[PDB]
């Protein structure tokens, strides 16, 4: 189950 | 400093096209559009990451289309506006998830620009019975006959805007509820000491800012063009 | 609904504890916010919470329970500037989904009610208005069954008013067979209500 | 015994050949169960183990929606990192990412990980305490400061301590027969002679699972890590693993030497 | 930009038994960057029906892949793995020895 949030570098 | 939006208000004849603009915080890679109607939360419309539109609300019509060409400012456009489009159109930007909103664009879609009327403003002076009974004096202001329903009411006493004692209705009421074209009314109070009102040197002004037609708009009738304007009414103290 | 908030306008006395809660549908959410929106304005963030438990910040306490998918906000010592719509906001992927909002009304503690109905006449001199004022915070005003006479609700007060405060409502019509004695006869008003002759 | 869930992501810029390559792969322990490849026909997340196929449409639409978001975000990252290191658009560059959670025998959270590499070297990593970042260089500090300001760690920790643990547990129960098995190694030995003076012997460990194992050599008890040849553990292709170890010593005298296999499935350390 | 030359192992899924079908494996690992070329060869001619696992990487960030093909070993037939990678001056060929 992937992490639903993503964070830009 | 902040998210900016223009126009802040906008009246549009049903069938015409309208375009809002949103200037986000320059470092925010993520930009969002929401729609909000009275008594409800912001409804999600679309989402941009840099210049790419990543998501769109599954219910959004192909009359709505949003763009962010260079990953900076954004525009949202409605084609063939109908009455159900009237709402607050909110822009928001974010570095990651926390959202920062612009001040919105408030859109009104009406069948004819001849339904747009400014307010008539009247001040009513304190009752003498209230004076002798409580030693305080309540002035009432009544903005009536206006459309659409957004106006801003302030009180000015001897040239200075006052808040102490001021009590304005939160939302306007409809004068002809069994009609879609209904014009609105709005009330406010200013309460002072009986002694302060009994001084004829004292000047009380109720000021109502109305948001109406732009300068571009085509006026078709004999009456004055119902543009964005301020309407005031006043009273002076009475020693009696 | 993806985000559900407690229904109904909340009315809480100046100085009491107001309390708002919220549930969200998707267990995989990670970001949770409380936003405040004044009546004619835009949502403004007041706090976020990301871990289970309590977050305290001034007069505000947020609680988050991930196992039960529950978000709360407690305001102690409520100011009149706390009157606003409170929006619960939860992430769905990298966007925020808002609940419908809960309206909070902070009531002035009216310590010497004196409900009276005053007749005011215009300064220019159309209509004239009846002013119903000085009632306590547990009176509510209902509209006419007259379609020709209009009634505002329990006058909301400017949030920067001082020294002493009070509640009001006005009513107005245009025709000669209209008096203040029977203006609010479809609302229920204290027996002691002053009707000056 | 301990268990783990990990996701592995690779993003490769294709200078002058359009969109970058994105590969995403997910493991439970040593068994791959999902994959997404930007080059493949489907553009969905795809099953790679039998026990994940039972998940329904909402799970697959959701994992697909998220894998495309990871993709979009890594595409932006490749541009950002080029800008950070002022690299030209002529070169191909790789961002790699791994995150996931371990649990113990009780299936309770043991550790979490969340780390990035750029062009093979460490870029930024979540520390063991799940509250701070190790930034490798001055460019990675720019990311560290962005992520501290936005409280990325706390959100990450919730995923890794809750959601991740939770879904690993679900997988371990649905893949019970596959995932919670232990395959003892099929041992044997081979004997050859390169010459008359020195002959070679090879210890063999086959068909075992999980992949963890140790092959050591003893000369009446010592450890002969001289003249030793250990191959990396390797996949057989059927879910099991292989490994072998061989040392060359004087022919005729090879029972002073003995090979000790140690693996979880072997109750006591088999010696040969 | 670090570069890492691949390790390469050619081998069969099951003990090699002449006549009986099996799978020939080529395991390439420890390499960086990820562009790699891997062919299985039969008497020096590349086998077409080869498939590979999904690209992944190890703790040290180096990549690994598994290429594999269905094959029935014989005594005369020679099987090989051919790998090419930016770190190789020439393509590396590793022949299959059934005792390794």
Residue numbers in the entry:
A (entry chain C): 1 to 9
B (entry chain E): 2 to 241
C (entry chain D): 2 to 126, 128 to 199
D (entry chain A): 1 to 272
E (entry chain B): 0 to 99
Provide the authors' original text about this structure.
The YLQ epitope has been identified as immunodominant in multiple independent studies, including one involving the BNT162b2 mRNA vaccine.
To understand how TCRs RLQ3 and YLQ7 recognize their cognate S protein epitopes and to explain the effect of sequence differences or mutations in these epitopes on recognition, we determined the structures of the RLQ3–RLQ–HLA-A2 and YLQ7–YLQ–HLA-A2 complexes at 2.30 and 2.39 Å resolution, respectively. Hence, Vα dominates the interactions of YLQ7 with MHC (46 of 54 contacts; 85%), with CDR2α contributing far more to the binding interface than any other CDR. Thus, YLQ7 contacts the HLA-A2 α2 helix mainly through CDR1α and CDR2α, with Gln31α, Ser32α, and Ser52α forming a dense network of four direct and two water-mediated hydrogen bonds linking YLQ7 to the central section of helix α2 via Glu154H, Gln155H, and Arg157H. However, the bulk of interactions between TCR YLQ7 and YLQ involves central residues P5 Arg and P6 Thr: 38 of 62 van der Waals contacts and 14 of 15 hydrogen bonds. This key residue makes extensive interactions (five hydrogen bonds and 14 van der Waals contacts) with P5 Arg and P6 Thr of the YLQ epitope, which are the primary target of YLQ7. Similarly, the CDR3β motif (92CASSXDIE[AQ][FY]F102)26 includes an invariant Asp97β at the tip of the CDR3β loop that, like Asp95α, interacts extensively with P5 Arg and P6 Thr (four hydrogen bonds and six van der Waals contacts).
